[PDB]
């Protein structure tokens, strides 16, 4: 590595052999590194780097294809996407500084409760039929051995007061597991899903949890179009409510400790 | 298997042998050695004698090495080496009950060899042994048979042809590894070349082999629990060969390698004739000596103990 | 199981024949070597 | 400058410290309290490292001075002062500047932590991000202070860094026999395994044949199924990667740890716990 | 014969597709680990003994 | 089960899924998927079936004589007497042929048994890499795993194959025993003049580094993004989510950059494949084109000054 | 092949591909081994000694 | 119980059980981690010197 060089053999010869694939790998990665998000937006702060450039040290990659599977579209990457929208306000007309969430930020759908428009449709199986749906149509998927059984269970919120009870879950058929609790609120009286990364157990106390948001927050959550399934598009924009709540279900959250 | 998670507690020991920072650090155990040195004590040295009156050979007839000392000091000499060897068994044990010439009792005609083998050590071999050197205790230590002599290890048991895999059994001698565990016959007997460490960048020069390096690891592993203590003391282990940088200690202990040999090679093997069975190996080979021996995991003997300071006959005449 | 007392019979009559089958190939294969290389 | 689905994330709140003070985004990095903080301490210290460079072990003007990038070295000061500040030349530089290491990597979680505050998302990473902290705390705090020395510390040197891992090593003679630092190694490796297995799984489903589809987690596991038989499971690999990684360097902490502070013979000699046991 | 009498009821509980699979693995295996054992023993037959060592006379 | 989505709270069952249909010539899988309420704890608890064919059988057994070999000998030098073989289990191990032999077959007693139980447990590995390769196509998979794989079996073989026979003599091949190979790494190192100082050997650790790195990331990450379904990855790559959303955004604000969801696995596969690549290399130089790494890095100026506050003679010049 | 009538009956319960495959390459390592294990000690044929060393008319 | 009069407002802000057992804990670690440290040199009254010598003198 040395500026100067005075010696030669065999070690060496193989040696500068690697850091050239592995500059060249590393660009390789690079490329594809930006199959999702670039171009930027704005300017902010000057793209910083040893060397500035355009869009970084590789050129933009070739769009790449994928055939979903049967009864499904395709998907190109990179692609083209259609601006999106900001419900908030700058903070300050400085650039990088953040954006406060206008009205209610536990619905204002940003930042933390903010989540892209996924595919209006549903994920399948490999055969075909809604890959993730609640154990009122799963006739097979039943409570493990032993495991305690959490339909019936009464879904307690962030503030402590219950917020409703579980009338059911939805299970996965592709891969067996609890993905989402179907949740019975009780304000609306509606039915919301709840998600198991939100979802916590108390087996002591036949309860399901949810520091995320309030009992009363559980009201207004994303519903569902089809009860006997849950789509990609409001399956993202479900659990993403809920974090909201990790951010906004209080005051004293957003609010500085120290 | 399991994880260790404390068998031994802190603050340790801590010895700065190389630059700030060069990793070379000695680290040991404050109790044990403690209770090491306090049970591993010498003797105190016998009263001076008057050194005069008429000498060794001058009366006593059958002498053949402590002549040139005088009668008080020779009987003091005689007084030292059985509390030193035979302190159980009194005298009788390289005498017969009366004949104080006598040559009949096998650990007598031994005593004589081990006597010059002795001075030797103190008088040719002092870079090694340094202005302290050596004394029938050091290796006896109060007994007949030094506890720490070794032998030509067998190995593992016979599988009818293919035992020769010599390697796979962890033996007291290398510390508890797995190596072949008996270097001190190929080496502390033998004179099998250590070094294995290419001198020259680039290969087709050193024709060394895997399996030798493996086998000079085994003698250092015993070598270091021997003197009892880690690589880092003799040398900073970047440079396991580069001596410019390796430490004094590393030469020191050089000579010995050899001041061992010369004490298995010109004395302990010769007297095999003599030894009976009971201090025979398996191999028929005589208990030989090692760096355990003296050392007996200390890397100063008895901690810098000098005895033979006090004790004229014990040095070349 | 997965069967009843009709084809469990004859299965084990059949089955037994071939291991006596075994036994007495083997014997006589341990004869013949006994014979050649004495163990013990 | 943001990425095409940034704007609609970069929301206000979310700090521990001072935040609605330092609480904007520089490029495509954040600052807010714990921003700044380790600045104050990367300048501070990665210059001094540079000044290492341009001093030497004994002097500028010396020939051993050197700026080979692998021949720079940083080591502590020595084992004499103990739990006490030597010369900023003779172990001062390492000292402090090991003080700017911590107050990089602690404030760089903590900064990441409000991060995720910000993103809802789960502390994971940060927390996980911590045993590697840890891990340095022991290898500059926690062993040294149990062997009442700041030199026992490594030297901040490319290569310096790896004598210092020989000796240390070689101390306890064959260091490969220690118990926790060989389990440590096994997580290491089967860490690869994961690596080599996970990120190979997916891009093999993703990116299938030629005028195939994308196939689904219905093959994933059958295909692990049919080379060994049973799938560990999609968010278990992630699981059990995250544990891997985090065991891999809590064992080594451990492994290091023990090595003198709770251990001054020879690891391979330790074995013979097992061997002096009353069965053979 | 004697045994066989009853004897006949064991496929009714064990299945004969387990037997017949795990026997030829054992028998095989256990086998193997004869001549192996054995070989490794003084007995062996491949260069123990006779064919006196041809080796040495031919080779040269 | 504390959820950081590290232990599945409540688990359900289904039907035991026995794969999906494979294409003609494949046989049908094999064997009655069970279930563990721990393991799945964990992760999935449904098991098997297993596919075994050709290949696979093939491979299975061959292996399986290497290990039996192995296991025997060990149990061999202890006389047959188990009581002392699980006791120096770990030093007990098949150590390969002397150097009085080179590359000639020896004798089941002097290294005989190391190079057959050697060659049994090559091809069973070059065996399961075809059986792996048989249950990609077979699946309309890719072969990422093979590559990878592959990769891995490259410095396998250069512990025997490339280099050693380059080298030509069996002697410098690393021995079948949990604590003796330990020592054959160890010695390789001795011999070689410390391989800190082999570039190559570096460059392969910032991967056994880099790769328990990343998956600390990327495994945690997916976790922290696990509520916003992150642990989906495949969907994900189809069309992005609001998992990868914002589980990219993090670590650019973090770190500056970022990848993609599909990207990163990308990089992982890179910083774990290429471990090894850097191991076969690192070994496959030594011994053959270096012999003393030490002397190599000093030679291109590599290797650090230290003050000399310790030094010692050389009896050898003096003398 | 006399024992073969009764022997048949094996076809109706075992998957016939099996015995096959498991034993086609049981074979394949049982043959490759053998050659070794004998190969490595009873006659080394292929270098060990007859015929016309190919080290002393070779090497010189 | 002096100051203790108007202390005990503080607790409607810190949680009863909360600092109380993370306390506990405190106490414990700090103990031992003092019985530790005045051991290692100061007064090592497990071995140091009498009334024992029961290893010294007994087992001799
Ligand atoms: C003779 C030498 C000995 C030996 C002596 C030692 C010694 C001595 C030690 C180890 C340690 C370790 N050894 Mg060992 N070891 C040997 C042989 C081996 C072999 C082998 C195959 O032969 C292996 C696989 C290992 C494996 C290991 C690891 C388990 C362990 C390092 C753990 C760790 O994760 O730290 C995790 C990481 C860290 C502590 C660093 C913290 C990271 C920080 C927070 C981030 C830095 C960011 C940076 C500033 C930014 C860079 C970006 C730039 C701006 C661009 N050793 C030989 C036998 N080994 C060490 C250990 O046990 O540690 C616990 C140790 O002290
Ligand atoms: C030890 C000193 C002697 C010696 C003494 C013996 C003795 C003693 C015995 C052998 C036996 C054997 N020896 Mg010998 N052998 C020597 C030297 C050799 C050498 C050599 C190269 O030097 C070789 C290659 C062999 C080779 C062999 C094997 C042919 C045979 C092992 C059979 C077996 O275990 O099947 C494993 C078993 C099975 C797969 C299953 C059971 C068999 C049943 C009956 C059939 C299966 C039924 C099935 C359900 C129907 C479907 C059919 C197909 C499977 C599809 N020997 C030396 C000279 N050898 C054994 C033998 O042949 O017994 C007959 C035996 O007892
Ligand atoms: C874990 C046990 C030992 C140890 C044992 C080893 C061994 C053994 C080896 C290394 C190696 C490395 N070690 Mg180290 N190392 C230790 C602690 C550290 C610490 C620390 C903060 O505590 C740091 C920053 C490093 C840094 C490094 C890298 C220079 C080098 C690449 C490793 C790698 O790829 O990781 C994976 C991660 C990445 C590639 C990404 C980030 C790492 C970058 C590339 C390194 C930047 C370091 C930089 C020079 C520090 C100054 C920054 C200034 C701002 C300029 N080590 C401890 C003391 N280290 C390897 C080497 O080649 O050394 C020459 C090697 O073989
Ligand atoms: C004192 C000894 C030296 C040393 C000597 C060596 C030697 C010698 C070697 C390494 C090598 C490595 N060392 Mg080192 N190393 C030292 C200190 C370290 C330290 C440290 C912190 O101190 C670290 C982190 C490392 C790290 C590393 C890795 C980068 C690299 C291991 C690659 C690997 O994947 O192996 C694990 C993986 C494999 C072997 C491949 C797997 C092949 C297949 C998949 C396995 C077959 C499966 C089979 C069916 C299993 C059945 C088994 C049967 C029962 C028999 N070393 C010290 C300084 N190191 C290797 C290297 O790359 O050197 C350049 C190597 O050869
Ligand atoms: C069990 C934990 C595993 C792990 C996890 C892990 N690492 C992480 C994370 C996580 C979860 C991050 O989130 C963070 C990251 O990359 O965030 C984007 C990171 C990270 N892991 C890193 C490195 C790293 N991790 C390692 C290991 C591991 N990381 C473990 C396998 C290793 C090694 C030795 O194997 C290294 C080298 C960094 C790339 C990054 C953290 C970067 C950071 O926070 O830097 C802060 C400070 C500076 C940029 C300035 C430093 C200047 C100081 C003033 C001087 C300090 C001197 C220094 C001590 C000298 C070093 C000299 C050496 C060359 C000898
Ligand atoms: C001698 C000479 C001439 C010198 C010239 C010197 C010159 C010109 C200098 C000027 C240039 C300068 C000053 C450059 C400075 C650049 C600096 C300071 C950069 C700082 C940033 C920094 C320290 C970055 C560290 C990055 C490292 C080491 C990361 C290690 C892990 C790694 C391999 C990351 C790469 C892949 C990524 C991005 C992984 C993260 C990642 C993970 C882990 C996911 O799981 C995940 C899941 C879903 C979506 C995305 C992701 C994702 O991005
Ligand atoms: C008795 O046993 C029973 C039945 C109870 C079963 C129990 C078995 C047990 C307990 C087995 C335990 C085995 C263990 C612990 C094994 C451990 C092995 C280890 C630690 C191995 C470590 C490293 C091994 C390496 C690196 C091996 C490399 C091998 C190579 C490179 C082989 C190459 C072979 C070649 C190139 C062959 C070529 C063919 C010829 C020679 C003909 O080419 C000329
Ligand atoms: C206190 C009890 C002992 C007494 C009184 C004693 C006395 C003597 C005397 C007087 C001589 C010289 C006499 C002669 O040869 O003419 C002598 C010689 C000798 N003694 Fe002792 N001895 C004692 C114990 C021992 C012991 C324990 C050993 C054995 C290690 C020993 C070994 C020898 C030897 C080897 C010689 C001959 C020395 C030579 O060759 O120069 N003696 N002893
Ligand atoms: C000058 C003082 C010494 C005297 C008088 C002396 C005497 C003896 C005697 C009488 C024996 C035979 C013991 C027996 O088996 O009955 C003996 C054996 C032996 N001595 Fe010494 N010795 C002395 C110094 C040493 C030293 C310094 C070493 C150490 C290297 C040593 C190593 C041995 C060994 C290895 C044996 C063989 C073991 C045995 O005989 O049981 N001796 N010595
Ligand atoms: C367990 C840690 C140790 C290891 C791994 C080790 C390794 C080695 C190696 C590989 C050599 C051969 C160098 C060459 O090729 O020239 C060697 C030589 C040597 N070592 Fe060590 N050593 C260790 C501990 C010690 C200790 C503690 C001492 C000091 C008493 C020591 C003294 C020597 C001497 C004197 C030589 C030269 C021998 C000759 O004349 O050939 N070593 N060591
Ligand atoms: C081949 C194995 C041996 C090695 C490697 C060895 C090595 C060493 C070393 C390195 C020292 C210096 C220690 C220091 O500086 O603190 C030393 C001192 C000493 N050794 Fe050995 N030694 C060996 C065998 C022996 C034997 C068999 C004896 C017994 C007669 C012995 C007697 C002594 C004495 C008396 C000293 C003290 C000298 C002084 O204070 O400087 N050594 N040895
Ligand atoms: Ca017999
Ligand atoms: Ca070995
Ligand atoms: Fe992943």
């Given at each position: 590595?040395?500026?100067?060089?005075?010696?030669?053999?065999?070690?060496?010869?193989?040696?500068?052999?690697?850091?050239?694939?592995?500059?060249?790998?590393?660009?390789?990665?690079?490329?594809?590194?930006?199959?999702?998000?670039?171009?930027?937006?704005?300017?902010?702060?000057?793209?910083?780097?040893?060397?500035?450039?355009?869009?970084?040290?590789?050129?933009?990659?070739?769009?790449?294809?994928?055939?979903?599977?049967?009864?499904?579209?395709?998907?190109?990457?990179?692609?083209?996407?259609?601006?999106?929208?900001?419900?908030?306000?700058?903070?300050?007309?400085?650039?990088?500084?953040?954006?406060?969430?206008?009205?209610?930020?536990?619905?204002?759908?940003?930042?933390?409760?903010?989540?892209?428009?996924?595919?209006?449709?549903?994920?399948?199986?490999?055969?075909?039929?809604?890959?993730?749906?609640?154990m009122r149509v799963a006739k097979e998927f039943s409570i493990a051995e032993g495991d305690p059984d959490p339909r019936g269970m009464t879904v307690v919120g962030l503030d402590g007061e219950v917020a409703g009870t579980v009338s059911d879950v939805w299970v996965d058929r592709s891969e067996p597991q609890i993905r989402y609790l179907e949740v019975e609120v009780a304000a609306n009286k509606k039915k919301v899903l709840l998600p198991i990364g939100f979802s916590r157990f108390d087996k002591k106390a036949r309860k399901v949890k949810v520091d995320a948001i309030k009992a009363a927050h559980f009201a207004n959550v994303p519903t569902l179009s089809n009860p006997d399934q849950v789509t990609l598009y409001e399956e993202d924009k479900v659990c993403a409510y809920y974090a909201g709540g990790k951010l906004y279900a209080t005051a004293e959250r957003a609010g500085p400790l120290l | 298997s399991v994880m260790l998670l404390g068998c031994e507690g802190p603050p340790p020991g801590t010895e700065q042998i190389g630059y700030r920072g060069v990793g070379m650090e000695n680290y040991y155990n404050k109790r044990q050695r403690a209770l090491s040195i306090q049970a591993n004590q010498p003797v105190e040295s016998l009263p001076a004698a008057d050194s005069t009156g008429p000498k060794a050979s001058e009366v006593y007839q059958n002498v053949q090495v402590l002549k040139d000392l005088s009668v008080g000091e020779f009987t003091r000499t005689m007084v030292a080496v059985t509390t030193w060897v035979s302190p159980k068994e009194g005298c009788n044990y390289c005498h017969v009950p009366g004949n104080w010439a006598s040559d009949d009792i096998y650990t007598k005609v031994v005593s004589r060899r081990m006597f010059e083998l002795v001075r030797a050590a103190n008088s040719d071999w002092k870079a090694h042994v340094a202005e302290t050197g050596v004394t029938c205790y050091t290796c006896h230590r109060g007994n007949p048979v030094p506890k720490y002599a070794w032998?030509?290890?067998?190995?593992?048991?016979?599988?009818?042809?293919?035992?020769?895999?010599?390697?796979?059994?962890?033996?007291?001698?290398?510390?508890?590894?797995?190596?072949?565990?008996?270097?001190?016959?190929?080496?502390?007997?033998?004179?099998?070349?250590?070094?294995?460490?290419?001198?020259?960048?680039?290969?087709?020069?050193?024709?060394?082999?895997?399996?030798?390096?493996?086998?000079?690891?085994?003698?250092?592993?015993?070598?270091?629990?021997?003197?009892?203590?880690?690589?880092?003391?003799?040398?900073?282990?970047?440079?396991?060969?580069?001596?410019?940088?390796?430490?004094?200690?590393?030469?020191?202990?050089?000579?010995?390698?050899?001041?061992?040999?010369?004490?298995?090679?010109?004395?302990?093997?010769?007297?095999?004739?003599?030894?009976?069975?009971?201090?025979?190996?398996?191999?028929?080979?005589?208990?030989?000596?090692?760096?355990?021996?003296?050392?007996?995991?200390?890397?100063?003997?008895?901690?810098?103990?000098?005895?033979?300071?006090?004790?004229?006959?014990?040095?070349?005449? | 199981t997965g069967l009843t007392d009709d084809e469990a019979k004859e299965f084990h009559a059949i089955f037994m024949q071939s291991m006596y089958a075994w036994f007495g190939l083997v014997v006589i294969a341990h004869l013949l070597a006994w014979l050649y290389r004495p163990w013990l | 400058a943001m990425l095409s689905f940034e704007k609609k994330y970069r929301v206000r709140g979310g700090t521990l410290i001072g935040g609605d003070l330092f609480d904007f985004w520089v490029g495509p990095f954040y600052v807010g309290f714990f921003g700044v903080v380790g600045f104050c301490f990367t300048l501070l210290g990665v210059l001094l490292i540079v000044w290492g460079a341009t001093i030497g072990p004994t002097g500028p003007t010396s020939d051993l001075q050197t700026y080979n990038l692998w021949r720079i070295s940083i080591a502590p000061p020595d084992l004499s002062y103990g739990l006490r500040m030597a010369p900023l030349t003779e172990?001062?530089?390492?000292?402090?500047?090991?003080?700017?290491?911590?107050?990089?990597?602690?404030?760089?979680?903590?900064?990441?932590?409000?991060?995720?505050?910000?993103?809802?998302?789960?502390?994971?990473?940060?927390?996980?991000?911590?045993?590697?902290?840890?891990?340095?705390?022991?290898?500059?705090?926690?062993?040294?202070?149990?062997?009442?020395?700041?030199?026992?510390?490594?030297?901040?040197?490319?290569?310096?860094?790896?004598?210092?891992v020989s000796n240390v090593g070689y101390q306890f003679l064959h260091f490969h026999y220690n118990p926790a630092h060989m389990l440590a190694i096994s997580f290491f490796f089967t860490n690869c395994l994961a690596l080599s297995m996970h990120g190979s799984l997916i891009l093999s489903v993703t990116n299938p044949q030629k005028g195939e589809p994308v196939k689904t987690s219905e093959h994933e596991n059958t295909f692990f199924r049919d080379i060994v038989g049973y799938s560990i499971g999609a968010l278990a690999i992630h699981r059990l990667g995250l544990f891997l990684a985090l065991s891999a360097a809590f064992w080594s902490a451990v492994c290091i740890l023990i090595s003198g502070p709770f251990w001054t013979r020879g690891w391979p000699e330790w074995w013979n716990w097992w061997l002096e046991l009353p069965l053979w | 014969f004697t045994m066989n009498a009853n004897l006949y009821k064991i496929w009714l509980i064990l299945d004969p597709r387990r037997v017949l699979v795990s026997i030829v693995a054992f028998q095989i295996v256990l086998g193997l680990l004869i001549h192996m054992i054995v070989l490794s023993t003084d007995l062996n037959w491949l260069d123990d003994n006779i064919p006196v060592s041809y080796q040495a006379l031919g080779k040269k | 089960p504390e959820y950081q989505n590290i232990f599945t709270a409540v688990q359900?069952?289904?039907?035991?899924?026995?794969?999906?249909?494979?294409?003609?010539?494949?046989?049908?899988?094999?064997?009655?998927?069970?279930?563990?309420?721990?393991?799945?704890?964990?992760?999935?608890?449904?098991?098997?079936?297993?596919?075994?064919?050709?290949?696979?059988?093939?491979?299975?057994?061959?292996?399986?004589?290497?290990?039996?070999?192995?296991?025997?000998?060990?149990?061999?030098?202890?006389?047959?007497?188990?009581?002392?073989?699980?006791?120096?289990?770990?030093?007990?191990?098949?150590?390969?042929?002397?150097?009085?032999?080179?590359?000639?077959?020896?004798?089941?007693?002097?290294?005989?048994?190391?190079?057959?139980?050697?060659?049994?447990?090559?091809?069973?590995?070059?065996?399961?890499?075809?059986?792996?390769?048989?249950?990609?196509?077979?699946?309309?998979?890719?072969?990422?795993?093979?590559?990878?794989?592959?990769?891995?079996?490259?410095?396998?073989?250069?512990?025997?194959?490339?280099?050693?026979?380059?080298?030509?003599?069996?002697?410098?091949?690393?021995?079948?025993?949990?604590?003796?190979?330990?020592?054959?790494?160890?010695?390789?190192?001795?011999?070689?003049?410390?391989?800190?100082?082999?570039?190559?050997?570096?460059?392969?650790?910032?991967?056994?580094?880099?790769?328990?790195?990343?998956?600390?990331?990327?495994?945690?990450?997916?976790?922290?993004?696990?509520?916003?379904?992150?642990?989906?990855?495949?969907?994900?790559?189809?069309?992005?989510?609001?998992?990868?959303?914002?589980?990219?955004?993090?670590?650019?604000?973090?770190?500056?950059?970022?990848?993609?969801?599909?990207?990163?696995?990308?990089?992982?596969?890179?910083?774990?494949?290429?471990?090894?690549?850097?191991?076969?290399?690192?070994?496959?130089?030594?011994?053959?084109?270096?012999?003393?790494?030490?002397?190599?890095?000093?030679?291109?100026?590599?290797?650090?000054?230290?003050?000399?506050?310790?030094?010692?003679?050389?009896?050898?010049?003096?003398?």
């Open positions: 590595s040395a500026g100067i060089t005075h010696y030669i053999d065999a070690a060496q010869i193989t040696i500068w052999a690697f850091w050239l694939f592995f500059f060249g790998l590393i660009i390789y990665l690079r490329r594809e590194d930006k199959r999702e998000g670039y171009p930027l937006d704005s300017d902010r702060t000057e793209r910083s780097g040893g060397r500035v450039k355009v869009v970084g040290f590789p050129d933009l990659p070739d769009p790449k294809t994928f055939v979903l599977p049967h009864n499904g579209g395709t998907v190109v990457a990179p692609r083209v996407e259609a601006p999106v929208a900001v419900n908030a306000t700058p903070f300050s007309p400085a650039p990088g500084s953040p954006l406060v969430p206008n009205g209610d930020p536990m619905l204002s759908g940003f930042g933390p409760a903010a989540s892209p428009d996924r595919p209006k449709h549903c994920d399948l199986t490999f055969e075909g039929l809604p890959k993730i749906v609640p | 032998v030509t290890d067998p190995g593992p048991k016979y599988p009818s042809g293919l035992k020769p895999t010599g390697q796979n059994y962890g033996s007291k001698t290398v510390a508890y590894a797995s190596l072949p565990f008996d270097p001190l016959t190929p080496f502390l007997d033998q004179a099998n070349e250590i070094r294995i460490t290419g001198n020259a960048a680039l290969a087709g020069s050193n024709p060394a082999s895997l399996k030798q390096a493996e086998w000079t690891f085994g003698l250092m592993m015993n070598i270091s629990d021997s003197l009892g203590v880690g690589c880092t003391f003799c040398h900073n282990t970047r440079a396991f060969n580069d001596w410019t940088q390796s430490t004094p200690k590393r030469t020191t202990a050089w000579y010995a390698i050899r001041h061992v040999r010369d004490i298995n090679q010109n004395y302990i093997w010769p007297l095999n004739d003599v030894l009976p069975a009971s201090r025979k190996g398996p191999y028929g080979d005589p208990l030989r000596v090692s760096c355990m021996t003296c050392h007996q995991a200390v890397n100063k003997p008895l901690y810098g103990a000098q005895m033979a300071k006090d004790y004229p006959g014990l040095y070349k005449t | - | 172990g001062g530089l390492w000292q402090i500047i090991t003080i700017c290491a911590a107050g990089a990597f602690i404030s760089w979680a903590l900064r990441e932590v409000e991060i995720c505050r910000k993103l809802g998302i789960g502390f994971h990473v940060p927390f996980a991000f911590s045993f590697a902290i840890g891990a340095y705390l022991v290898l500059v705090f926690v062993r040294p202070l149990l062997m009442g020395a700041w030199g026992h510390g490594f030297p901040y040197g490319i290569l310096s860094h790896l004598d210092w | - | 359900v069952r289904a039907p035991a899924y026995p794969g999906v249909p494979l294409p003609k010539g494949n046989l049908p899988r094999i064997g009655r998927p069970i279930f563990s309420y721990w393991l799945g704890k964990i992760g999935d608890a449904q098991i098997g079936p297993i596919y075994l064919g050709l290949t696979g059988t093939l491979s299975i057994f061959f292996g399986l004589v290497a290990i039996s070999i192995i296991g025997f000998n060990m149990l061999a030098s202890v006389h047959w007497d188990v009581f002392q073989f699980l006791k120096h289990f770990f030093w007990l191990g098949l150590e390969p042929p002397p150097p009085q032999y080179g590359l000639r077959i020896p004798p089941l007693s002097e290294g005989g048994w190391w190079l057959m139980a050697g060659l049994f447990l090559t091809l069973s590995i070059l065996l399961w890499w075809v059986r792996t390769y048989k249950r990609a196509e077979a699946l309309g998979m890719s072969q990422h795993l093979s590559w990878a794989f592959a990769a891995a079996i490259f410095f396998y073989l250069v512990l025997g194959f490339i280099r050693p026979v380059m080298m030509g003599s069996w002697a410098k091949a690393v021995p079948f025993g949990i604590f003796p190979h330990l020592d054959w790494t160890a010695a390789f190192s001795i011999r070689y003049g410390n391989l800190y100082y082999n570039p190559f050997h570096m460059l392969s650790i910032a991967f056994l580094y880099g790769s328990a790195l990343l998956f600390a990331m990327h495994g945690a990450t997916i976790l922290s993004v696990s509520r916003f379904g992150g642990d989906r990855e495949i969907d994900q790559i189809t069309h992005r989510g609001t998992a990868a959303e914002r589980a990219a955004l993090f670590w650019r604000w973090t770190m500056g950059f970022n990848v993609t969801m599909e990207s990163i696995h990308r990089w992982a596969w890179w910083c774990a494949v290429l471990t090894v690549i850097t191991a076969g290399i690192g070994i496959l130089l030594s011994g053959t084109v270096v012999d003393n790494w030490y002397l190599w890095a000093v030679k291109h100026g590599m290797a650090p000054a230290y003050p000399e506050v310790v030094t010692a003679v050389n009896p050898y010049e003096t003398a």
